Amino acid sequence: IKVRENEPFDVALRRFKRSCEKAGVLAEVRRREFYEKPTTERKRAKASAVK
Amino acid sequence: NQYYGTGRRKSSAARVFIKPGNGKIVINQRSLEQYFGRETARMVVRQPLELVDMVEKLDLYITVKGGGISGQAGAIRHGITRALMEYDESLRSELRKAGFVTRDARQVERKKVGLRKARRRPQFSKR
Amino acid sequence: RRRVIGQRKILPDPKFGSELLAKFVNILMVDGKKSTAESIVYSALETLAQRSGKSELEAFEVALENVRPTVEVKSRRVGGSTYQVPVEVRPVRRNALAMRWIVEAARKRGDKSMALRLANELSDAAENKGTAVKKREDVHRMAEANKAFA
Amino acid sequence: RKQVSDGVAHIHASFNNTIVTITDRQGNALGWATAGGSGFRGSRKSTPFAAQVAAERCADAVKEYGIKNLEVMVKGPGPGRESTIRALNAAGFRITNITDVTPIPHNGCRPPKKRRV
RNA sequence: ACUAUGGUUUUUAUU
Numbered sequence: 282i283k284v285r286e287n288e289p290f291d292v293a294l295r296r297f298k299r300s301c302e303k304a305g306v307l308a309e310v311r312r313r314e315f316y317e318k319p320t321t322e323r324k325r326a327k328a329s330a331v332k
Numbered sequence: 333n334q335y336y337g338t339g340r341r342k343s344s345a346a347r348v349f350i351k352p353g354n355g356k357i358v359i360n361q362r363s364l365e366q367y368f369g370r371e372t373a374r375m376v377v378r379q380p381l382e383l384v385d386m387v388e389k390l391d392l393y394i395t396v397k398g399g400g401i402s403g404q405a406g407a408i409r410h411g412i413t414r415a416l417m418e419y420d421e422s423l424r425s426e427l428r429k430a431g432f433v434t435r436d437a438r439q440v441e442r443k444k445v446g447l448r449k450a451r452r453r454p455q456f457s458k459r
Numbered sequence: 460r461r462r463v464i465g466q467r468k469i470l471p472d473p474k475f476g477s478e479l480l481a482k483f484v485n486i487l488m489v490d491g492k493k494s495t496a497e498s499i500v501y502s503a504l505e506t507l508a509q510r511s512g513k514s515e516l517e518a519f520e521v522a523l524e525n526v527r528p529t530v531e532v533k534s535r536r537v538g539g540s541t542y543q544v545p546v547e548v549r550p551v552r553r554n555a556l557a558m559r560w561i562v563e564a565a566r567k568r569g570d571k572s573m574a575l576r577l578a579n580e581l582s583d584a585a586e587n588k589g590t591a592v593k594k595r596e597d598v599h600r601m602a603e604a605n606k607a608f609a
Numbered sequence: 610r611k612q613v614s615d616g617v618a619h620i621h622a623s624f625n626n627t628i629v630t631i632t633d634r635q636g637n638a639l640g641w642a643t644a645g646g647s648g649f650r651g652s653r654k655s656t657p658f659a660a661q662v663a664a665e666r667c668a669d670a671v672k673e674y675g676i677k678n679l680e681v682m683v684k685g686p687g688p689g690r691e692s693t694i695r696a697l698n699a700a701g702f703r704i705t706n707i708t709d710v711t712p713i714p715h716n717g718c719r720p721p722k723k724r725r726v
Numbered sequence: 727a728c729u730a731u732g733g734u735u736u737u738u739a740u741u
Contacts, residue, residue, distance in 0.1 A: 283537075283608060284688050284727090285721050289709055291691070297723045330725055331717035428461045534729040541729040604648065606658035624727080652728055719727090 339411025344399025612675030622687030640670025660689025
């Protein structure tokens, strides 16, 4: 991340890969009638914003 | 047994015989270094020959005509591998490993229309 | 195993004592006329051993140890910005660049061409003196005045 | 000539500089170093390296006064604000606390939002 | 938020 986040922190939260913009989102609950999946846990893919 | 291989490259054509026996090489009924000694491709025919070790147990007899030396040497190298892959079919796996059983990616194509050699880019300065 | 490595490309010479040869005789070579660029093997260093000191076993080995590029400085993208950064000189280039970089005195020294030029530029390079060495330490400090992220 | 043993380190990171100063147990500055005093210019005085060697040169600026423990005060948003600590963690004395504060906090303080607006 | 770096889009014509 270099200069885009300084803080005291070099740690990262790992919730943001294969969870957003897809599955899902542009095709929300589109096929197969699943209701578990990473698309329900997408409410954990936050913060990130505000520090 | 007499193991035979043909080879051809850019208007040159060669024939190779491989036999078991005494470690000798003959070309156009001359010695390998009897008329060559300054030509820039004269060593490339040795590339497949060390793969089975040289001049100790194998007899080579080569004939060639047509074209120029870089053509003749490339034709002879592939004629040697086409004969050597008959002498032992397990060498096929080793000749692939060095590229010596394939026709190389340089061959003569027909003249592109007009424009001198028809490969260069003409004037396009903006002046 | 068939398609593995693939090995060779070039082979080591028992008499020259350097693997740079296949890129050293590529210098001042035009229209594929290699023998007019290969004219410095067993001739120019035989003359260096008759113009500066004695022997030639380490002269070309030590001249390129004294003139050694290690860093280069470029404007490079992070997107959309293009920060200046120092980058290390790539391992296959690191000792193969400096031997081609002694050109800004070649038409001025009057050294009587090719092998006699080489017999003078190496006696400066073997002390890190003369041509292009002020520019080498200028790049070394261009990378000292800014070290970026590492 | 004598050992102070206790003190405080004062760090600042700007978008155009990095500063490190060390004070004794009575608040007297024993030595100070800046990245501009380290030969750097412009925002390059804020590089993580220039911040690390400015701190290393400040540890060299207090090498004789005899230090065993101190606390750190970190100011400013500048990119030097992490690398400045690594040379101080190598100065040979203990860091008991680090108080971290940036000026004018508002609007979330500009973290990466990871595919959000 | 950082290739250090170029002023500003002529009077105005009328198949």
